[PDB]
Design a binder for this molecule. Sequence first.
Ligand SMILES: O=C(O)CNC(=O)C(=O)O
Ligand SMILES: [Mg+2]
Ligand code: NI
Ligand SMILES: [Zn+2]
Length: 331
Amino acid sequence: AQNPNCNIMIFHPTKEEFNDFDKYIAYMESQGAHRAGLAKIIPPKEWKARETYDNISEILIATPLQQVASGRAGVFTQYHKKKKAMTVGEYRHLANSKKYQTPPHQNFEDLERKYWKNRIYNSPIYGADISGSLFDENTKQWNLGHLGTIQDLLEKECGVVIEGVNTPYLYFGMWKTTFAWHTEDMDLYSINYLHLGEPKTWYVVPPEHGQRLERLARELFPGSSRGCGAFLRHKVALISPTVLKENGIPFNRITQEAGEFMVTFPYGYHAGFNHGFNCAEAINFATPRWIDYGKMASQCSCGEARVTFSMDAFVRILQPERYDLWKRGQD
Ligand SMILES: O=C(O)CNC(=O)C(=O)O
Ligand SMILES: [Mg+2]
Ligand code: NI
Ligand SMILES: [Zn+2]
């Protein structure tokens, strides 16, 4: 068995290997990358996403989200308070202000210490989930707006034609902006490209151990767990590495820098934080190996998780027994 300790693997494809996206994902899995739940892909030196980032300031962040924490430093939830619209230029200035800017630090480990010590005492503002792309249309390799769609994959594997679309999302971050512990919708893959700015630190639980994380989360968030049998689908709970280690939960960590891709694999729980002002692009995708995970994915039916239009078909076709209850949660 390749990668039996479930370590995060880092790949350096050549320009030739960067042509065929599906083939390279399958290659990474042949080497055991998926066992970690997360892999890093460093693009060949010849590649670029676009020519420059000098002209992005006029993008609008219609609904910036202030991430307000509750709990203790290592075990907390966050809720998202909606703020007034602002441009990317306005948000960048905000991120760099004395109130929000990255503190002085020695290295990524010092910054990580500071994040876990102090996160709850601040409420950073995240420009998340903005439909759009920063890839140049002429970038032909690993262009996250030109991937094969999940609807087409389902149709290729299973023969059923379904409605729905699959487009990327932009994320503008600042120091302490946080992504809560989650797997993707329908336990899909994700791919995330850090276009510019400061790093993103990731934490990940191997897919084979995801239920250990779920059991800890039910212990640590007992009211949330009584409310919903899949409350991590709400994407609000944080647990620190120290708490994970104290509870014996297998996990790994890695820092993504600008110009690097990360892939999350089906049922790979992940969480993390941004180091300072940055911009990432991410999208979900599928492969043949996903189908079995999609069929088994948990679902939130309590009403909290509320998701895209395109998840309807995935539930309807892969999980017809669950469909009626899940759709009630949608309405
Ligand atoms: O970058 C973020 O805030 C969150 N991203 C992801 O969870 C991802 O790409 O799957
Ligand atoms: Mg612009
Ligand atoms: Ni994710
Ligand atoms: Zn729920």
